[PDB]
From Swiss-Prot:
It comes from the Eukaryota. Alpha-conotoxins bind to the nicotinic acetylcholine receptors (nAChR) and inhibit them. This toxin blocks mammalian nAChRs (alpha-6 or -3/beta-2 or -3 > alpha-3/beta-2 > alpha-3/beta-4) when heterologously expressed in Xenopus oocytes. Does not block the muscle nor the major neuronal nAChR alpha-4/beta-2. Discriminates between nAChRs containing alpha-6 and alpha-3 subunits, being selective for alpha-6. Disulfide bonds join C4-C10, C5-C18. Expressed by the venom duct. It comes from Conus purpurascens. Belongs to the conotoxin A superfamily. Residues 6-8 are annotated as: Ser-Xaa-Pro motif, crucial for potent interaction with nAChR. This is Alpha-conotoxin PIA. It is found in: Secreted. The cysteine framework is I (CC-C-C). Alpha4/7 pattern. The modification Cysteine amide is found at C18. The chain holds residues 22 to 39 of 40 of the full protein.
Amino acid sequence: RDPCCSNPVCTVHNPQIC
């Protein structure tokens, strides 16, 4: 599991792992 995935904020700018 990714780290930026735990935060719904980063998830937006990180839609490649989530």
